[PDB]
mmCIF file of N, CA and C in Angstrom:
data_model
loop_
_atom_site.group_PDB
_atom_site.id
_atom_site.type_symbol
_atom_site.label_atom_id
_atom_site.label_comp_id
_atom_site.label_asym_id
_atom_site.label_seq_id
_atom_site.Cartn_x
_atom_site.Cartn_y
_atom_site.Cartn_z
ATOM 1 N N UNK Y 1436 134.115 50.343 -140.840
ATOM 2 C CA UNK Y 1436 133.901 51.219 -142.031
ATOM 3 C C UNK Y 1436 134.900 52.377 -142.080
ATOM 4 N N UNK Y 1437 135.296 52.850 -143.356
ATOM 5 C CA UNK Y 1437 136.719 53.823 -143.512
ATOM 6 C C UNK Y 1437 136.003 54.712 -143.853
ATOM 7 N N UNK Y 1438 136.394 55.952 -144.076
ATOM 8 C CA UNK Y 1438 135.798 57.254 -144.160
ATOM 9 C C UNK Y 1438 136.109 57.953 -145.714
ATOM 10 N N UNK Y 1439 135.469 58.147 -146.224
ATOM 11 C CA UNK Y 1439 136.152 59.463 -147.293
ATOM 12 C C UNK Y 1439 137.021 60.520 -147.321
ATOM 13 N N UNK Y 1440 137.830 60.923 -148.075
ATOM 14 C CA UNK Y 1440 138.195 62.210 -148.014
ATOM 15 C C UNK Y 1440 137.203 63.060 -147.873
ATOM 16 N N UNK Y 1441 137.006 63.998 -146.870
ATOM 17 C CA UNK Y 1441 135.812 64.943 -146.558
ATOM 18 C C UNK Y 1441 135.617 66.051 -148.111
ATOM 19 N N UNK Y 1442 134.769 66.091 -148.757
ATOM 20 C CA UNK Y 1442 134.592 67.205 -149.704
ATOM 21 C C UNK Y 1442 132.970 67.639 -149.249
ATOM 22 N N UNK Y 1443 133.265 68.848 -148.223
ATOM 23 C CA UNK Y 1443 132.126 69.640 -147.743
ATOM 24 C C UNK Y 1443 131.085 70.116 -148.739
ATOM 25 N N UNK Y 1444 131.461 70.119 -150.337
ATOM 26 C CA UNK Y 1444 130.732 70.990 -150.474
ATOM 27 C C UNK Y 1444 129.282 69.871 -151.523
ATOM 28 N N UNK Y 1445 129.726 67.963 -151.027
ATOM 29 C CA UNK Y 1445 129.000 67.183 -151.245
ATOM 30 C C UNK Y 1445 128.126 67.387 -150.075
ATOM 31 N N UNK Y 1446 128.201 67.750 -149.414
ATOM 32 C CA UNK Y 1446 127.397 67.657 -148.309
ATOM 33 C C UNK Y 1446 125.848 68.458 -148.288
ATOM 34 N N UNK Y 1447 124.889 67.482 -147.689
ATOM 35 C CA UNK Y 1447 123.355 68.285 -147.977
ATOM 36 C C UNK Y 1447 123.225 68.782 -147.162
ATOM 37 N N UNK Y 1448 122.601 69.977 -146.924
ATOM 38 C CA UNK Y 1448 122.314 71.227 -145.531
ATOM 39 C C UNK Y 1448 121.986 70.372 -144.427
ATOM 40 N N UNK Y 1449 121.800 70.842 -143.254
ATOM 41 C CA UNK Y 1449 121.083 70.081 -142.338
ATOM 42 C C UNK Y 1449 119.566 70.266 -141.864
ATOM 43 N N UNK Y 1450 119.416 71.903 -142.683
ATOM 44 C CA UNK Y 1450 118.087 72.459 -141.921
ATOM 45 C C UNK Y 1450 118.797 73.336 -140.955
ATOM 46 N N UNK Y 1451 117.177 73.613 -139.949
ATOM 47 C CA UNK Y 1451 117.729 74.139 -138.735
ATOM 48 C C UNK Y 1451 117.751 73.001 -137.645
ATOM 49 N N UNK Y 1452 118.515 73.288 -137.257
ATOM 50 C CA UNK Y 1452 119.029 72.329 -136.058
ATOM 51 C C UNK Y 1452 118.730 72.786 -134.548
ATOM 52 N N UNK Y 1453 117.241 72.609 -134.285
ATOM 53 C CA UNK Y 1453 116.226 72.957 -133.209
ATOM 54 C C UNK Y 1453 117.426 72.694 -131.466
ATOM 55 N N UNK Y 1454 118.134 71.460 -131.746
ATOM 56 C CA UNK Y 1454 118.864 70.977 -130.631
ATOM 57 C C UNK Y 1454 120.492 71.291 -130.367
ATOM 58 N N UNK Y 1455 120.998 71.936 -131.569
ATOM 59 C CA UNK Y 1455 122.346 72.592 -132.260
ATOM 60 C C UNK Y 1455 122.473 71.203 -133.445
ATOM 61 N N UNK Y 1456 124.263 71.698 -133.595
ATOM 62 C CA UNK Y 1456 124.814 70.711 -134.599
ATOM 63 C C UNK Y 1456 125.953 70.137 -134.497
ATOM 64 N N UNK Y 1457 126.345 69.226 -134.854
ATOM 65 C CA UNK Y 1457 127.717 68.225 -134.888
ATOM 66 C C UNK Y 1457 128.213 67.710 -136.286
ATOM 67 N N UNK Y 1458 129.062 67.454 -136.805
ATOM 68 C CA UNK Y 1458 129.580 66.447 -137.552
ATOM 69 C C UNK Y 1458 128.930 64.783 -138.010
ATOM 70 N N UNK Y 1459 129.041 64.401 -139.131
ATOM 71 C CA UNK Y 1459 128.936 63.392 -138.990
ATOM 72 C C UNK Y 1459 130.108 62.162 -138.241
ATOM 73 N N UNK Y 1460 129.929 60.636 -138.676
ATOM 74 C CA UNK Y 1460 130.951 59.902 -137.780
ATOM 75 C C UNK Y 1460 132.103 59.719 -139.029
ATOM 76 N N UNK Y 1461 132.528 60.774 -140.120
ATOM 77 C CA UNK Y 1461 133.185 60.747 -140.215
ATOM 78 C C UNK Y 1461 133.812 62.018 -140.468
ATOM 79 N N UNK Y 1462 133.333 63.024 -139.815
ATOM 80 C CA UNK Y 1462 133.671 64.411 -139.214
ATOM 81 C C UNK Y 1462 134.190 65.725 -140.635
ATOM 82 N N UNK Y 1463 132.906 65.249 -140.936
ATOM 83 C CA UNK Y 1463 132.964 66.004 -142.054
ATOM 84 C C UNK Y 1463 131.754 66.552 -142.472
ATOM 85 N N UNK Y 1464 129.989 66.086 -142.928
ATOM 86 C CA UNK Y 1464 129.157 67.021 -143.116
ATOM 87 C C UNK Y 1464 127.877 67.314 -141.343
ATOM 88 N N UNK Y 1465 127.648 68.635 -141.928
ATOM 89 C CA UNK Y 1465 127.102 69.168 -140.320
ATOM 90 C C UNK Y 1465 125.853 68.552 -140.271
ATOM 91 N N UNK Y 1466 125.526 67.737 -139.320
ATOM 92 C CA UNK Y 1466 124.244 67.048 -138.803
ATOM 93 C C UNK Y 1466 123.202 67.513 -137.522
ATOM 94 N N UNK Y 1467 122.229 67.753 -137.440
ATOM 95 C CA UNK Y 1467 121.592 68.456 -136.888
ATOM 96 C C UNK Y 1467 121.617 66.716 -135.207
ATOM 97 N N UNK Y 1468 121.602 67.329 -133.777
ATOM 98 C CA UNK Y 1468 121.453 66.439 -133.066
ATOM 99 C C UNK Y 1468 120.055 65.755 -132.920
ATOM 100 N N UNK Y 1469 120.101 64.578 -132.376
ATOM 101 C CA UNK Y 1469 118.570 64.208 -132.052
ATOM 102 C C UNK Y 1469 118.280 65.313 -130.680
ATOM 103 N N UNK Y 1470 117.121 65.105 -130.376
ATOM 104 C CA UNK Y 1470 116.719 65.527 -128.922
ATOM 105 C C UNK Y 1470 116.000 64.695 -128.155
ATOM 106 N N UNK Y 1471 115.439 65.103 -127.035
ATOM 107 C CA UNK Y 1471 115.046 64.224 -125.999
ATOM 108 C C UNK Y 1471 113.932 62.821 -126.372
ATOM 109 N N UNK Y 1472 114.132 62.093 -125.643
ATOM 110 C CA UNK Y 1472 113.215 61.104 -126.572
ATOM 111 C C UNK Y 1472 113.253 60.361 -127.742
ATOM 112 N N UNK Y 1473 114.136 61.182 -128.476
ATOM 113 C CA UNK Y 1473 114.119 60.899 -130.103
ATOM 114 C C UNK Y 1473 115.502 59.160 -130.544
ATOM 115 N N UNK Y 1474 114.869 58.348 -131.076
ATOM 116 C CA UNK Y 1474 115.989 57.519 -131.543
ATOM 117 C C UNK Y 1474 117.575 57.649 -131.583
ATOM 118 N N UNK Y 1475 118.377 56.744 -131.004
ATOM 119 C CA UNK Y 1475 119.859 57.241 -131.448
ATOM 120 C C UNK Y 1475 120.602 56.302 -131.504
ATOM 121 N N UNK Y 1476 121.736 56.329 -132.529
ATOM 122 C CA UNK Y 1476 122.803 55.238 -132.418
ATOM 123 C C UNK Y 1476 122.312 54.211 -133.594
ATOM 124 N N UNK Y 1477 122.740 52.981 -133.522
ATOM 125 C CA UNK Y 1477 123.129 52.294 -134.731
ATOM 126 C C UNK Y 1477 124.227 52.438 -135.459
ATOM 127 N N UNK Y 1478 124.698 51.730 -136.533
ATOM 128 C CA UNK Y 1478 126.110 51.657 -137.483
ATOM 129 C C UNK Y 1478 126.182 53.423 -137.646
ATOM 130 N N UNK Y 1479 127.308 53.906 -137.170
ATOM 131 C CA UNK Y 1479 127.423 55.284 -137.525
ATOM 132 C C UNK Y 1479 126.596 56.365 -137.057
ATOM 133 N N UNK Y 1480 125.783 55.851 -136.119
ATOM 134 C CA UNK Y 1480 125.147 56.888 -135.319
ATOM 135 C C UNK Y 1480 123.497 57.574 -136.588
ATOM 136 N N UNK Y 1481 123.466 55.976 -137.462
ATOM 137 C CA UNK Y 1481 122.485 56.185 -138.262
ATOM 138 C C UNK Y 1481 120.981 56.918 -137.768
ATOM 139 N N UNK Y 1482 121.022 56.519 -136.862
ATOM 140 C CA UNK Y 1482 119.540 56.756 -136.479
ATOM 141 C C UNK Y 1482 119.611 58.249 -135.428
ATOM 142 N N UNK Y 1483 120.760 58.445 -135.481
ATOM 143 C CA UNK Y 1483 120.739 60.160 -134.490
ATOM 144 C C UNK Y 1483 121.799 59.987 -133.845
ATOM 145 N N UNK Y 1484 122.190 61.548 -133.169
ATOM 146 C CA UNK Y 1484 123.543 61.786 -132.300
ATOM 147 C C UNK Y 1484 122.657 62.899 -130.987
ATOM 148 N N UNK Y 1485 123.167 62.115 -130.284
ATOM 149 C CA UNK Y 1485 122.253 63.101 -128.793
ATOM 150 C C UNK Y 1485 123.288 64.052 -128.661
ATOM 151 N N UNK Y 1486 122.342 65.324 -128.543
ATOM 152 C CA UNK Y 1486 123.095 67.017 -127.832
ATOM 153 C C UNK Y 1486 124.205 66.732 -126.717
ATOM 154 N N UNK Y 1487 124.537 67.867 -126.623
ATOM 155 C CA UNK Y 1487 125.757 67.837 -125.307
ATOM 156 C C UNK Y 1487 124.805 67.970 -123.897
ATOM 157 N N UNK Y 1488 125.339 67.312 -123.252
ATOM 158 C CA UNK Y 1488 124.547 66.867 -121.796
ATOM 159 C C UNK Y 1488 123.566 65.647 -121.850
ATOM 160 N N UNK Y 1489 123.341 65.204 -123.264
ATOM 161 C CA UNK Y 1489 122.478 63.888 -123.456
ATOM 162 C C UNK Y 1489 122.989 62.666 -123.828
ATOM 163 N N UNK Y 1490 122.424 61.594 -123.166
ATOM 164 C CA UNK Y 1490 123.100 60.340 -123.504
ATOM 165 C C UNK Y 1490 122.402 59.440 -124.448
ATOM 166 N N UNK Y 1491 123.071 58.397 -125.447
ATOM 167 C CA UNK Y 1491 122.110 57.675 -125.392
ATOM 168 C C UNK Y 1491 121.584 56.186 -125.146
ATOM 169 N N UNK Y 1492 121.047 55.879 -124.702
ATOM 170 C CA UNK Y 1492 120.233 55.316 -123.651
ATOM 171 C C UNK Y 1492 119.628 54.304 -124.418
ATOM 172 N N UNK Y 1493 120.095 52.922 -124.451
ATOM 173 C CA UNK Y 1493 119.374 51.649 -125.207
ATOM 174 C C UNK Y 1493 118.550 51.650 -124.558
ATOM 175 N N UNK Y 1494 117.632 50.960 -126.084
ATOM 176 C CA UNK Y 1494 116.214 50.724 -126.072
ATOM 177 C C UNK Y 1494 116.047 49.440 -125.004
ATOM 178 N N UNK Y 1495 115.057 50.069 -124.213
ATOM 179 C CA UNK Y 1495 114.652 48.651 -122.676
ATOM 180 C C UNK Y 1495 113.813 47.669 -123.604
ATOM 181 N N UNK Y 1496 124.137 45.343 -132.397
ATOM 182 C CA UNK Y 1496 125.783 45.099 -132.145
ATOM 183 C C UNK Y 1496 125.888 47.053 -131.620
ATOM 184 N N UNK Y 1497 126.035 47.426 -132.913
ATOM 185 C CA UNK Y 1497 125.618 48.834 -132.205
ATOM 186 C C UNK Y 1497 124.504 49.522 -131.606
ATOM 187 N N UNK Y 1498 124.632 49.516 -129.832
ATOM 188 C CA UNK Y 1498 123.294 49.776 -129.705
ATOM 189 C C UNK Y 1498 122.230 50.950 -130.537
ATOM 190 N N UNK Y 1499 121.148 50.796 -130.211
ATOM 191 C CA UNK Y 1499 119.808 51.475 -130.739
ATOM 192 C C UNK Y 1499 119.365 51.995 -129.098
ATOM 193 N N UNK Y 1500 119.224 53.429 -129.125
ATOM 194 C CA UNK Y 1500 118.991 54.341 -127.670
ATOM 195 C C UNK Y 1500 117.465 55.044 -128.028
ATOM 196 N N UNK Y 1501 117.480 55.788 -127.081
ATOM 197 C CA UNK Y 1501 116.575 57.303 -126.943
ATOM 198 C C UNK Y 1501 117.707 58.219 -126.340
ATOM 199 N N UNK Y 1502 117.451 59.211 -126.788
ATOM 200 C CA UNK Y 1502 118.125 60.691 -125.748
ATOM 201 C C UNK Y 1502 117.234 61.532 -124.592
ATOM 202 N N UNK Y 1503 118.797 60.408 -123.389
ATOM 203 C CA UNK Y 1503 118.157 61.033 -122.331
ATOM 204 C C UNK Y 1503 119.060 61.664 -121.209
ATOM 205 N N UNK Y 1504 118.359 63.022 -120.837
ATOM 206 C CA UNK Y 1504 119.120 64.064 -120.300
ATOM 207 C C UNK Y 1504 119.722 63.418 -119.238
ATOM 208 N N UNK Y 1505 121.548 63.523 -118.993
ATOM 209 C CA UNK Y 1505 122.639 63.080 -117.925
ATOM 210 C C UNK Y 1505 122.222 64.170 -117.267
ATOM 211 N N UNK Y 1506 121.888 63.680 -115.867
ATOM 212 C CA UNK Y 1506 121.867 63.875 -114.646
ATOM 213 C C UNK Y 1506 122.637 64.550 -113.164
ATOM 214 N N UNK Q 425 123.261 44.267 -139.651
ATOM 215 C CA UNK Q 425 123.029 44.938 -137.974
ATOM 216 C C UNK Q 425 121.732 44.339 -138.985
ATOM 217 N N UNK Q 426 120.801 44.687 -137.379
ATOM 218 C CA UNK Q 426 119.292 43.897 -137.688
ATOM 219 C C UNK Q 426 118.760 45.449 -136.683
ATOM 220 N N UNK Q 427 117.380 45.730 -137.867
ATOM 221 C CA UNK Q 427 116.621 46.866 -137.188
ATOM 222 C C UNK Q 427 115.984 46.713 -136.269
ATOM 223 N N UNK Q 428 115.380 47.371 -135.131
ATOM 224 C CA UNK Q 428 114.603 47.754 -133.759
ATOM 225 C C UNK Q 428 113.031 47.432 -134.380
ATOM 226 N N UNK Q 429 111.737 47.246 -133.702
ATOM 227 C CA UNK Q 429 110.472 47.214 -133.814
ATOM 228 C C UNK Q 429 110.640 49.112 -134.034
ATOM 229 N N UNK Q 430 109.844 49.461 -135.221
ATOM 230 C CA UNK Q 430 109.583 50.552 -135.383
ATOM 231 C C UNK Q 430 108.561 51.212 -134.439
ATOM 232 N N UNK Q 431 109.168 52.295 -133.618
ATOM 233 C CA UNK Q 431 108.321 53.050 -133.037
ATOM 234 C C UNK Q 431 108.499 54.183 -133.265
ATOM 235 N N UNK Q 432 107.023 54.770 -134.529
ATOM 236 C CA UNK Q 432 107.168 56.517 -134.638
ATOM 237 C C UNK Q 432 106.980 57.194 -133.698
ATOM 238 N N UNK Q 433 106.970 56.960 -132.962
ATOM 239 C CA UNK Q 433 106.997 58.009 -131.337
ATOM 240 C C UNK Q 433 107.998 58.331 -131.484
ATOM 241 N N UNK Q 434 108.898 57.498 -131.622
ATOM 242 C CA UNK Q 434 110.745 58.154 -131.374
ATOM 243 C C UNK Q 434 111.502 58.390 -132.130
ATOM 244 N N UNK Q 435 110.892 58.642 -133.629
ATOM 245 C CA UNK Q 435 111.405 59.616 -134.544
ATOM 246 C C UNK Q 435 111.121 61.114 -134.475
ATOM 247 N N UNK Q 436 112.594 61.708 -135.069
ATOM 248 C CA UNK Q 436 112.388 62.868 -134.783
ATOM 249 C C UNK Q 436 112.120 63.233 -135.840
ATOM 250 N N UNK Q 437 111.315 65.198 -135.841
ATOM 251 C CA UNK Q 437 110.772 65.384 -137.386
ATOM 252 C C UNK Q 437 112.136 65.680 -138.504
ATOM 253 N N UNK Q 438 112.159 65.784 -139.436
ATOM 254 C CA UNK Q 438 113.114 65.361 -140.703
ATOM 255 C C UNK Q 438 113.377 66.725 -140.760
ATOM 256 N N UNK Q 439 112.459 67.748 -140.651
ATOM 257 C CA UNK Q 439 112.460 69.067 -141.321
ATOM 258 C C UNK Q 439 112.153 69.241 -142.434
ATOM 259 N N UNK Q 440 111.834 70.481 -143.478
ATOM 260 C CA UNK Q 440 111.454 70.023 -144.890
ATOM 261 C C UNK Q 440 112.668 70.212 -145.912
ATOM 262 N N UNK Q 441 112.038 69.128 -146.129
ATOM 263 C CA UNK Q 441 113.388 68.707 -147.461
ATOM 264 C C UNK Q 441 113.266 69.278 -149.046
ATOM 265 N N UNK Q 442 114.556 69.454 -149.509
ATOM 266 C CA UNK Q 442 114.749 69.928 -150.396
ATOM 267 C C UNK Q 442 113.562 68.940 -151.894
ATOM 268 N N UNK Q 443 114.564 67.682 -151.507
ATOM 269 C CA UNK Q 443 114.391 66.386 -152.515
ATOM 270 C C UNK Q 443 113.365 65.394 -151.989
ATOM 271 N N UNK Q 444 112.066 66.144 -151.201
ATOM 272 C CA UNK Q 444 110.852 65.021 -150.947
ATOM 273 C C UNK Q 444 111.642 64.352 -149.870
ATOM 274 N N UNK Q 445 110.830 63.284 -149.307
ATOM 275 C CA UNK Q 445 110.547 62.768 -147.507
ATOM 276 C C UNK Q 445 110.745 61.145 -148.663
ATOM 277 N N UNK Q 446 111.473 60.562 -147.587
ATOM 278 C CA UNK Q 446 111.606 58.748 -147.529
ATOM 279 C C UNK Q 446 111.211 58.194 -146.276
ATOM 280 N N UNK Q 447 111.968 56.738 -146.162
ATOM 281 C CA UNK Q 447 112.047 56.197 -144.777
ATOM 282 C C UNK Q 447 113.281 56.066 -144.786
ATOM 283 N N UNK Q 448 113.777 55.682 -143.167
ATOM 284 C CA UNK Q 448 114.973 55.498 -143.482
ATOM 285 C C UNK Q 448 115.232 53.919 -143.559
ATOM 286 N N UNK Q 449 116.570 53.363 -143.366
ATOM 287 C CA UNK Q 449 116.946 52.277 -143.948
ATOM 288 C C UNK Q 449 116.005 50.858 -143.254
ATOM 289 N N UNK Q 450 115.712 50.966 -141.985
ATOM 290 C CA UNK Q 450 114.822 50.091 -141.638
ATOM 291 C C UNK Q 450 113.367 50.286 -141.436
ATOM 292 N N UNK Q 451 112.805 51.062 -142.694
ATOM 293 C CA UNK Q 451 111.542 51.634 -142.919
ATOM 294 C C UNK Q 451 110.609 51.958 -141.991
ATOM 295 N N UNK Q 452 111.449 52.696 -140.757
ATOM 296 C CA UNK Q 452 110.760 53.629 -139.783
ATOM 297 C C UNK Q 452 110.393 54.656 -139.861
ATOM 298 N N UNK Q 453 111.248 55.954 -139.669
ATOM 299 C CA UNK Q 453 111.353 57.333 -139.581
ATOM 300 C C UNK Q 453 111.385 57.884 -140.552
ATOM 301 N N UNK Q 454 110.799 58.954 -140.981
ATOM 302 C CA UNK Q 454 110.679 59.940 -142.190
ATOM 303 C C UNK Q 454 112.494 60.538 -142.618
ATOM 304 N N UNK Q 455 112.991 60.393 -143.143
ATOM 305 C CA UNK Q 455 114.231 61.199 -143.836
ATOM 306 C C UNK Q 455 114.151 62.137 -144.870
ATOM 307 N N UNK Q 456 115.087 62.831 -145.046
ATOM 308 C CA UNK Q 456 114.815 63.613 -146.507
ATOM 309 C C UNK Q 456 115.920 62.624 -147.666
ATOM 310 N N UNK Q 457 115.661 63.061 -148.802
ATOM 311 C CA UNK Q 457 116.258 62.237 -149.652
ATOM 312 C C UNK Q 457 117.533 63.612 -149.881
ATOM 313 N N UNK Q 458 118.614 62.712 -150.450
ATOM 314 C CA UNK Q 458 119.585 63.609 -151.160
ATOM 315 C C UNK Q 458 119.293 63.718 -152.217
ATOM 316 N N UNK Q 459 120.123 64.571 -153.029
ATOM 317 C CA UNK Q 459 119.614 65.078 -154.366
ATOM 318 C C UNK Q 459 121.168 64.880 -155.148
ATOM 319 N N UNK Q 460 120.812 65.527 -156.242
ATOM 320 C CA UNK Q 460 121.881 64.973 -157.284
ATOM 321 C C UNK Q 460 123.181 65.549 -156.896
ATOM 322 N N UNK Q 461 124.497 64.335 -157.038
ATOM 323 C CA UNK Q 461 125.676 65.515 -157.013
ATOM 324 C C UNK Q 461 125.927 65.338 -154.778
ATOM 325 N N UNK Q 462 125.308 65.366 -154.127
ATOM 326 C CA UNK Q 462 124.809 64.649 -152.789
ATOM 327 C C UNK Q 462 125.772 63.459 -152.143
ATOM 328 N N UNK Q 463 126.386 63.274 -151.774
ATOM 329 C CA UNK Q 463 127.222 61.850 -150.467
ATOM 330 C C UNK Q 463 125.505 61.108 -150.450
ATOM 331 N N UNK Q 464 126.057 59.941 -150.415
ATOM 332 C CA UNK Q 464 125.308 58.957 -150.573
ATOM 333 C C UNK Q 464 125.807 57.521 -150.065
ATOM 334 N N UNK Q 465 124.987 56.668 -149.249
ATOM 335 C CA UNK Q 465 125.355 55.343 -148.930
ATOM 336 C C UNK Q 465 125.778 55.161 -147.299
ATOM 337 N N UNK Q 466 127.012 54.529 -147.720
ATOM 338 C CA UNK Q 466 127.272 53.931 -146.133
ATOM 339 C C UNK Q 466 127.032 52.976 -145.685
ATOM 340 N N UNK Q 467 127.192 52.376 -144.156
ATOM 341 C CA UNK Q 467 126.227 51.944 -143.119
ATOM 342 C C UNK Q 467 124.790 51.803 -143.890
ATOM 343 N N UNK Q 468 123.762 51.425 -143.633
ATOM 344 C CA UNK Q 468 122.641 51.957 -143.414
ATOM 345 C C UNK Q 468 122.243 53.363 -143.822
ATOM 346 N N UNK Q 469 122.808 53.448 -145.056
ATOM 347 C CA UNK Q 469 122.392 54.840 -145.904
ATOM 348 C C UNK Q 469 122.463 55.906 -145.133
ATOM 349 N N UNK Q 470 123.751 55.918 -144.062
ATOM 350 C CA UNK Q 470 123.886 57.278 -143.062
ATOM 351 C C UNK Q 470 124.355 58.505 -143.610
ATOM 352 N N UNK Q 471 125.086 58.426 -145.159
ATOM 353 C CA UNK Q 471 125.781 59.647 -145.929
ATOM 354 C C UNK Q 471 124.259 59.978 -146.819
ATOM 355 N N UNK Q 472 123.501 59.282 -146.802
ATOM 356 C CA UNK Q 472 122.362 59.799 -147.561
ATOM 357 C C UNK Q 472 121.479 58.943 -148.055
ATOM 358 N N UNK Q 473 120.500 58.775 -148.824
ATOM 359 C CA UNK Q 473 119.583 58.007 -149.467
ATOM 360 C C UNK Q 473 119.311 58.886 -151.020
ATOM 361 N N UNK Q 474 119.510 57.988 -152.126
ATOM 362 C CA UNK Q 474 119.213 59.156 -153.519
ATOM 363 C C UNK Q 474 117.887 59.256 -153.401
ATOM 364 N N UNK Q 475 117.044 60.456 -153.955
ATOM 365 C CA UNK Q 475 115.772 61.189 -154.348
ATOM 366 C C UNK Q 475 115.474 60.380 -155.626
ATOM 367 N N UNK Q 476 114.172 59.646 -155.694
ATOM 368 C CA UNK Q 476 113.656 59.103 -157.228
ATOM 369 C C UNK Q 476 114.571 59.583 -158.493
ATOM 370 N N UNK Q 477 114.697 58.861 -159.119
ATOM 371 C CA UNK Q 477 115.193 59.336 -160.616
ATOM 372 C C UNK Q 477 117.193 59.327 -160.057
ATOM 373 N N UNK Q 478 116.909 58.882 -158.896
ATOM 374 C CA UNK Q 478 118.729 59.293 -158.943
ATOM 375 C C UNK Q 478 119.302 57.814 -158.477
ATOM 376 N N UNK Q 479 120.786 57.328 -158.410
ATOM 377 C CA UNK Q 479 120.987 56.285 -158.002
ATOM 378 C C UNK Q 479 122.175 56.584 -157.332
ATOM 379 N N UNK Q 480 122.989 55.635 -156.280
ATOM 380 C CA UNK Q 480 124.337 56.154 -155.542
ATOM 381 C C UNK Q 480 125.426 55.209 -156.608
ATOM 382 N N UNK Q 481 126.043 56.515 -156.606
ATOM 383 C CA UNK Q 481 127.248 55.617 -157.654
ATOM 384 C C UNK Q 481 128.607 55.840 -157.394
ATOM 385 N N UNK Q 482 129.328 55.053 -157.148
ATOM 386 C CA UNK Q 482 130.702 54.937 -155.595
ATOM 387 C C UNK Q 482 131.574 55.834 -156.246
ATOM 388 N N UNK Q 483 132.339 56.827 -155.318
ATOM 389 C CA UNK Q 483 133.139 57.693 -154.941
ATOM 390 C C UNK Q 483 134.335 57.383 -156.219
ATOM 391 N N UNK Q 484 135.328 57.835 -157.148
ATOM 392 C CA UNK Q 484 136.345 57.380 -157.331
ATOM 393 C C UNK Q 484 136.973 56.483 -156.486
ATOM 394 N N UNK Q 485 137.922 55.266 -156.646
ATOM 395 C CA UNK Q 485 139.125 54.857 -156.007
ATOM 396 C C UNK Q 485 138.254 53.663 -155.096
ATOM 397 N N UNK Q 486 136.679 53.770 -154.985
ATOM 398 C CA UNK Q 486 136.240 52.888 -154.142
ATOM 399 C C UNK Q 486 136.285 51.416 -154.261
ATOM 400 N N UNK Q 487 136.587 50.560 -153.477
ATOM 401 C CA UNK Q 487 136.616 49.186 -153.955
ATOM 402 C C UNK Q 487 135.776 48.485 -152.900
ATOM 403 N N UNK Q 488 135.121 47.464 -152.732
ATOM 404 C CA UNK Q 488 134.485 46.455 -152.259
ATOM 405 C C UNK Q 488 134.282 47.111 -150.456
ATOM 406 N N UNK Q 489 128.671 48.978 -147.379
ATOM 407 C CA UNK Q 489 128.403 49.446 -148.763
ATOM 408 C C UNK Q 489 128.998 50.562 -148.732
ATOM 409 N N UNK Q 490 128.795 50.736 -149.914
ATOM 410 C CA UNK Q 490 129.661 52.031 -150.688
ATOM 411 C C UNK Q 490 129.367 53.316 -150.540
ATOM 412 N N UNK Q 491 130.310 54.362 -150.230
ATOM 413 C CA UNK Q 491 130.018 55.956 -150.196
ATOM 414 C C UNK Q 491 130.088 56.106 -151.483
ATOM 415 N N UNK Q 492 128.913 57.652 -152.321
ATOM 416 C CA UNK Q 492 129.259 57.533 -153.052
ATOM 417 C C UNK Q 492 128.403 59.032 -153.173
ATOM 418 N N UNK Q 493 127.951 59.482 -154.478
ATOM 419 C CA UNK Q 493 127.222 60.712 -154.690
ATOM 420 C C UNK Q 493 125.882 60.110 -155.468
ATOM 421 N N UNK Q 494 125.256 61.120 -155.633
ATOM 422 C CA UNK Q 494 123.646 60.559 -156.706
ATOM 423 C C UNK Q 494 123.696 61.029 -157.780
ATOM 424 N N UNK Q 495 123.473 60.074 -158.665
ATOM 425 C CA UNK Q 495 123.608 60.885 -160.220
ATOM 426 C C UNK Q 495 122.720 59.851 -160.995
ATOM 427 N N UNK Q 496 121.732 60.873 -161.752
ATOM 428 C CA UNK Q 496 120.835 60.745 -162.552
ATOM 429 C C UNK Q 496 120.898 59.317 -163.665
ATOM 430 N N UNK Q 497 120.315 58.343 -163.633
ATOM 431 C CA UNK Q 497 120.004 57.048 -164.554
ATOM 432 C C UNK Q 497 119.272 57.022 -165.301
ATOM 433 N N UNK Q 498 119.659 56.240 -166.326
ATOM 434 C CA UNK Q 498 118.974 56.070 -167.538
ATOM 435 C C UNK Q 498 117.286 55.566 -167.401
#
């Protein structure tokens, strides 16, 4: 999948972002992270992006995780 | 891609949304909807999902799913 020209100001808020924030996967609107436990990954990181220090961790093509704290 | 067995345990909360609560693309987890004027599509509706009354309608220049914004239908 190719990306858009980024125009930020299409972009919908994120809220507050309890875990911080990142980019989307095509580095352009601000996305709030998943946190511990919470779903992650799929096409584009659809289903969540784990915080810094968290991995994510397929569920026991693009994997499907949980976020779980690296060790 | 083919979706996971839905488990709401491991959704996280959405926060409250501007444009009302959905599911997301493999009718698990609560999302918020985008609203008009909004990035829309993708993957698995990762740039957004339109809010009732709105539809995703592709970006200029787009060709052959589609990014796009939400704008109001007949």
């Amino acid at each position: 999948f190719t990306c858009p020209e980024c125009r930020p100001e299409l972009c919908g808020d994120p809220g507050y972002c309890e875990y911080g924030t990142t980019k989307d996967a095509c580095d352009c609107c601000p996305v709030c992270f998943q946190g511990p436990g919470g779903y992650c990954g799929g096409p584009e990181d659809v289903f969540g992006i784990c915080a810094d220090g968290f991995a994510c961790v397929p569920l026991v093509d693009p994997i499907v995780g949980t976020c779980v704290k690296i060790p």
